[PDB]
Amino acid sequence: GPHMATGQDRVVALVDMDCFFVQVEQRQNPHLRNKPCAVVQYKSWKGGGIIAVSYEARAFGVTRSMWADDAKKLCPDLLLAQVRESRGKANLTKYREASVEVMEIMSRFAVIERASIDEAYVDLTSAVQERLQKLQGQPISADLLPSTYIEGLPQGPTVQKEGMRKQGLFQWLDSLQIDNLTSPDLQLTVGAVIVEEMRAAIERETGFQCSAGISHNKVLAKLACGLNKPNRQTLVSHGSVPQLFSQMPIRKIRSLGGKLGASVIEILGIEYMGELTQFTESQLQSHFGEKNGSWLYAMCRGIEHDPVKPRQLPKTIGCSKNFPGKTALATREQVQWWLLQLAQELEERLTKDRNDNDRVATQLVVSIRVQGDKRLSSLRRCCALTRYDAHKMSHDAFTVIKNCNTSGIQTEWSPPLTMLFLCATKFSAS
DNA sequence: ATTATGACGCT
DNA sequence: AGCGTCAT
Ligand SMILES: Nc1nc2c(ncn2[C@H]2C[C@H](O)[C@@H](COP(=O)(O)OP(=O)(O)OP(=O)(O)O)O2)c(=O)[nH]1
Ligand SMILES: [Ca+2]
Ligand SMILES: [K+]
């Protein structure tokens, strides 16, 4: 009743760049704009592996993880842009730099949490209170929300997408109570106004379009963002959660798309997020652990407490390369050469990071995968990272992995290595 | 033979 | 610390 907290205390947005690497390449090369386009890594094996797909190409069934040769079967006119190769490996610097452009613009509006290269959460609670004070009771015009969808509307008693969007927005705005400065629905609405402004600034100042979700917490804002892509934003109110969740597959909620979500489905014999409400908190904790159980109990009611962390920079800077099938590394010369290639990329990135961000990494994590191991990492070892020197870094990595060589000969490496990974971690201010 | 990442939880 | 999960 009057005491049951409803998880409506914050305004959180999730901003996600549409098909981000494609947009980076389309900005650079206008011939790719408004075309079925994808970004690929490498080319010799089956045309390269697709990692990003324009919405025009998605209409033909092109997806990430597809080989370009197969994508071309679905879409013979598909245009391709290739990720840069440096020191024998994919080099994602162009996309990291473009991501910094976008994150710096978002940071003008509020403190952001960098969730990925192209995704950031925004805590808008304070900006919303300020904008509400500036308003002073004045209602919110639909013109301030020209790309906003209100999830679940229109409802109750046209045949074009934009017409439906406007019908729902009008129902939403008509039901608003713009007098109550503490009203969660009003706060969300002002949050959406701010996100329209943020998205307009990103597009004006970078050329990049994005989608966004606005809700009361990170999971709902993420879910909201996915409802109307591309180049649109979606408001998911607390009141919209029962209907939204009543047909929402559990796997769609961030963190439930893997083994844990599959076990929720199998153990409880349910399919949809809303079905979780029938279980007590103790029941859920009994099946899924204390933390997961409490999280599921609140999540299925629309409530989540995970804060938007003030962190605009990545916590780790890493470099990795697979050596699949017959390219696996089987000589000491080979292992050392590739460790050096990875370490030289890492040194370049770390040196730029130290100049830009006033910090230094102090730990080097070395990860490998041996041939025949189903796991992604067969072994991880840390050592001290005391100098930004690629030769020292690769010699240290070799030292921490050299005992894994089963071969009796020192020249040979067995079982061959199918992956090398160097990661700088544990940053300190400098 | 997807691949190059990056975050975070567990013990 | 080293490993596993999840994300994409
Ligand atoms: N190297 C590599 N990059 C990836 C992989 N998956 C995604 N990326 C990159 C390319 C994407 O443009 C970027 C952002 O990922 P997203 O999942 O947000 O998809 P994207 O932005 O392409 O499309 P969207 O409009 O958000 O559905 O991350 C991957 O498996 N390997
Ligand atoms: Ca994206
Ligand atoms: K993303």
Author numbering: -2 to 154, 160 to 432
What did the authors write?
Using X-ray time-resolved crystallography, we visualize the complete DNA misincorporation process catalyzed by DNA polymerase η.
To start the reaction, we equilibrated Pol η crystals at pH 7.0 and then soaked the crystals in reaction buffer containing Mg2+ or Mn2+. Within the active site, the incorrect dGTP was assigned with 80% occupancy according to its density. In the ground state, t = 0 s, the Me2+A site was occupied at 30% by a monovalent K1+, and the Me2+B site was occupied at 80% by a divalent Ca2+. In the up conformation, the primer 3′-OH was located 3.7 Å above the substrate α-phosphate while the sugar moiety interacted with R61.
